[PDB]
Amino acid sequence: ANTFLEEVRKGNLERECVEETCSYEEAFEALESSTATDVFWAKYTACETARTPRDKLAACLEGNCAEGLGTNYRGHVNITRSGIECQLWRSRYPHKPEINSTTHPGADLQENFCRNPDSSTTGPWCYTTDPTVRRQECSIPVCGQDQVTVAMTPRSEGSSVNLSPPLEQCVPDRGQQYQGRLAVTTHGLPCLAWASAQAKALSKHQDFNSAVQLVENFCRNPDGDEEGVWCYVAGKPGDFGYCDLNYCEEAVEEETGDGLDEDSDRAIEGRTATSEYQTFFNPRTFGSGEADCGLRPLFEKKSLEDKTERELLESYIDGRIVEGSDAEIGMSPWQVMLFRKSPQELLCGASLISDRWVLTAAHCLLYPPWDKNFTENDLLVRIGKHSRTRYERNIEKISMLEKIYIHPRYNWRENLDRDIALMKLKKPVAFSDYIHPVCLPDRETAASLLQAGYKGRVTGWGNLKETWTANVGKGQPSVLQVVNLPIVERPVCKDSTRIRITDNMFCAGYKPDEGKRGDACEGDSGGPFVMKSPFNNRWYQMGIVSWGEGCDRDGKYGFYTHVFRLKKWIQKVIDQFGE
Ligand SMILES: [Ca+2]
Ligand SMILES: [Ca+2]
């Protein structure tokens, strides 16, 4: 700085910038690289509060503490004032950051380490991994004294003392024979009387088991829905609402058939087995397509199997990881894109399920952390596509929807449980070569698919990659990305994740090798996971694609939400308009 005679010799960054008072210039002279130099400049603007004295600046350049509001904080704390783990700073999962590393890299916002880029009154604050807390302040040690930026109050787990622990058994038989006194639904709204006029009118043509003496107003499921217990509510005709019960983890994954002979070698493939498929919905109200499910005229009528089907055996060479490749045109007539009318922006994906219904995930429709409230006139569908970028009027079609039904058990705040949404097509869709629905595995068929050794298939166009993985370098693909993933073992699916994953979701993907971000984070949100059943040469869609932990950090497969518990659910919707 001063003593201009000094402005001849080689100056040490310390000797010219600290104790004296240097600008960017003498610093640069000392260093000669604008990257770390402007790291130093970012500190300097931050150390504007740390210009004097010496230590004040030595520590400020050290980076081990937050200056009050923490604009200087360059540490690595991943806990909020309550200890909540912070979200990815660069990405918007699960809440959109107003000011981020693209905006203020001068605060050096790392992956999830606690920061303060906007100089808000909260001090060091981070968007949190838990969707419940959009922004929570981080307790960061104070520069110069044994203090922190905000009070630390970790939310430690509650003891099992003040709460009366229920020894009551979990509800068996999917709540068909439940014998408690439950009187609260998902919203807490009480039910009506069973013998009411609306309830009788709606359940006149509903398949109920008369063995259950339907009690006064308790949650009863005489239709044997595999999702849980439900009861009628007032309002619009035909409506209902599921209740809240502590169900057993009676997942189909560990259900081994009581007829599976102990001779599991030289397995008999489809051997002239005319495996009829039993339609479960009402064809008058659900529409056609269930009968023609799983039969591709280009494949089933041509006796052709896709060049990606030859991998369907899990008996490949050591099951080595294979990256995805482009599929044949017309091999995915059901793949649909959920799009925004204004602006025309890529939002989500799905698969066509019938001639009148479109099934997607519940998170794609309602994600309030992104100011999203999507109604009938703010959603559109693009069907029969091979490329997104082109306008394929002859093959791809653009359609609107009429009514939207969301699942009552929608829990996006924690784990995207019951990621289910059903929207009725506004215009009838004509069956052709590039338009087709899919089958829906029941309990036993899906059990056979899981335990007999068959791979599933997920189709998507990489919307999740643009939305959630903010790394610049992997753009939105132009071709449909199709990935074959077998089933994952349940302790493997549960142990490596901290979030309580419900039995309505499951993992799909190979073991993650060290040193890479896996292939489970490819495709659109809401995609289908389809598996081919050897009995009838057809394809059954197990569920819906949602967000996966494999994107944000390594070591995770794709997490997808089941649909086999929703059959009895789906009918309950159409009977509202099926009169
Ligand atoms: Ca000087
Ligand atoms: Ca100088």
Ligand SMILES: [Ca+2]
């Ligand atoms: Ca000097």
Ligand SMILES: [Ca+2]
């Ligand atoms: Ca100099």
Ligand SMILES: [Ca+2]
């Ligand atoms: Ca000079």
Ligand SMILES: [Ca+2]
């Ligand atoms: Ca010195």
